[PDB]
Write a protein that binds this ligand. Sequence first.
Ligand code: HEM
Ligand SMILES: Cc1ccccc1Cl
Length: 432
Amino acid sequence: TAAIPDEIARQIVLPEGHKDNVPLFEAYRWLRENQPLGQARVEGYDPLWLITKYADLMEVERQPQIFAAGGGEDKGSNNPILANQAGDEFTRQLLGGNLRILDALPYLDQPEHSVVKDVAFDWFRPANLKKWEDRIRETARASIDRLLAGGPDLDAVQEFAVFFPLRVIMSLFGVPEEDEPRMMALTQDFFGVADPDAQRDDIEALSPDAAAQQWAATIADFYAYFDVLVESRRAEPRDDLATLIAVAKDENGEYFPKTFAYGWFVAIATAGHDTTASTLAGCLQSLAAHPEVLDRVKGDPDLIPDLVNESLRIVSPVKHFTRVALQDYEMRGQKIKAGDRLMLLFQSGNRDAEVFDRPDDFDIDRRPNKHIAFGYGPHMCIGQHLAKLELKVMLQELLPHLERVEVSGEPKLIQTNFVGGLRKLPVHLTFS
Ligand code: HEM
Ligand SMILES: Cc1ccccc1Cl
């Protein structure tokens, strides 16, 4: 019944707690082994049930009528992305009493979530993505040509891994190549709200609500950009994902409000590339630690999907979403009360020893690989099949050209409790 001990709680709740994976994952592990379902009571944050166990992540996510993302009928009464209390108070001042700062899927509950998700559900299905595979492969090959041309010493993140997923999504989305640097800069602002090296110049960086001010400022910039794109595609439809979303109409034949398109566009323009980049960079880091794995996958390219799945499990770049209990609920001998918030720790679920043998080992021979890196339930990642296709295609084209990866300098992670992973991975590559 006791609260989680303060230093374990802070390690997971505070963005600074995620600056180094070793103490973070040790805190995950301490909870899974000693307090698998406890409440973190960190100063400046609401109390949070920390959902650390794989089974409990599934139990919560499969019950959206009990555990809401946005607050149920009181729309925007829960922030699905953990802000501090001061930040949620900033947002309630900005919006007028609620936290629904985007109309994007994470903020929605059923049935609204189901209606909006159905706009793009079919586009994202694996069979409907096959038509993009050749364009993806041409983009991978061009990115690899530049890697070979630039020589063996580089930052595998900022000088390689970031560009391929961004070009893929912007090409499919319909954003011109000259706008990629702007989308990359706003993505860094968006996922860097609490990172000391990613602060915007137009917000008070040291204010208690700084991250929330940066989140809002970045969204306003994305809205200004996407307003032009929505109007453009409504006026002149094209065969791109921007058009599918911009022209979408509800069951009465009326356009969805423009903010619904902007929500899709923010998600596609940020998570649509950043997570794939993180997973690719994490894969390279693991191939440096496990050179026998690189040798094996060059020997059998049919192992590439297994390598992708184990990179997703280990990297798990999307760290959490929050839920709120709409009624009292008992789980794992604990009494969650109506109104209590939950933090879904996907990275911890992915290390649960009840599910994965030697969960901290990089083992591509987990078959099936039961990872929960894409979450679960009706909110399960819509982009999962595009991410797995892009990572497969890039590795099929890249690994033949790599004999060895060496990490030659200190890796750096984005300091976030939300969408993280590497921002820097200095390497020495040996080309074949
Ligand atoms: C390695 C790549 C990725 C990982 C690990 C990842 C992971 C996740 C996770 C854990 C969630 C939350 C699921 C939940 O609430 O249960 C999520 C949601 C989502 N992701 Fe992905 N993601 C990846 C790539 C992508 C891509 C490529 C796109 C789009 C092109 C995308 C779009 C979304 C959207 C729109 C949501 C919100 C879904 C909803 O709330 O219904 N993701 N992702
Ligand atoms: C903002 C965001 C982050 C991760 C996955 C999806 C979305 Cl929409």
